[PDB]
């Protein structure tokens, strides 16, 4: 059959619509630095952190468009208020507990 455990891109969703903080999680990097996008800070007891997000992620896609390697202004311009946003983050590894069932 098929076997795909190691590696699994998760789908994080952040809503708020208010230039106060953002989506609960800050990003870092940018094509301007030669790097892509990744979580830099994640607020506790927040929605993001609730979605699974955590300091040490990689925003592969946002909403629909794929950042990959865009200026910090690009990624940002992609993030922030913009209707039901879909944060695409990749994960590599599993923890003990509820995961498969």
∠9-49-87 over CA atoms, to 5°?
Answer: 40
Identify the CA nearest to 56 among candidates 25, 99, 13, 14. 25
Please tell me the distance from the alpha carbon of residue 5 to that of residue 20, in angstroms, as a whole number. Answer: 38
Domain annotation for the chain: domains and CATH numbers? 1-101 (2.30.42.10)
d(Cα 23, Cα 65) in Å, to the nearest integer? 17
- Gap between the Cα atoms of 22 and 47, Å rounded: 11
- Alpha carbons 59 and 74: distance in angstroms, whole number: 12
C-alpha distances out from residue 50 to 14, 31, 44, 45, 87, Å: 10, 28, 8, 7, 13
- Experimentally determined by: NMR
Whole-angstrom CA distances from 16 to 33, 45, 65, 94 are: 29, 15, 20, 29
- Please report how many Cα atoms fall inside a 13 Å half-sphere around the Cα of residue 4, on the Cβ side: 5
Which stretches within the chain are classed as H helix?
47-51, 72-78
List CB contacts of 58: < 8 A, sequence separation 6 or more. Answer: 36, 37, 38, 39, 89, 90
Q: Are 1 and 87 in contact (CB under 8 A)?
A: no
Closest by Cα among 74, 88, 91, 87 to 35: 74
Q: Quote the CA–CA distance of 78 and 88 in Å, as a whole number.
A: 12
């Amino acid at each position: 059959g098929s076997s795909g455990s190691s590696g699994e891109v998760r789908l994080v969703s952040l809503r708020r619509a208010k230039a106060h903080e953002g989506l609960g999680f800050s990003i870092r990097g940018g094509s301007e630095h030669g790097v892509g996008i990744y979580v830099s800070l994640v607020e506790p007891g927040s929605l993001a952190e609730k979605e699974g997000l955590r300091v040490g992620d990689q925003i592969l896609r946002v909403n629909d468009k794929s950042l990959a390697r865009v200026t910090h202004a690009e990624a940002v311009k992609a993030l922030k208020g913009s209707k039901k946003l879909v944060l695409s983050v990749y994960s590599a590894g599993r923890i003990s507990g509820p995961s498969s069932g």
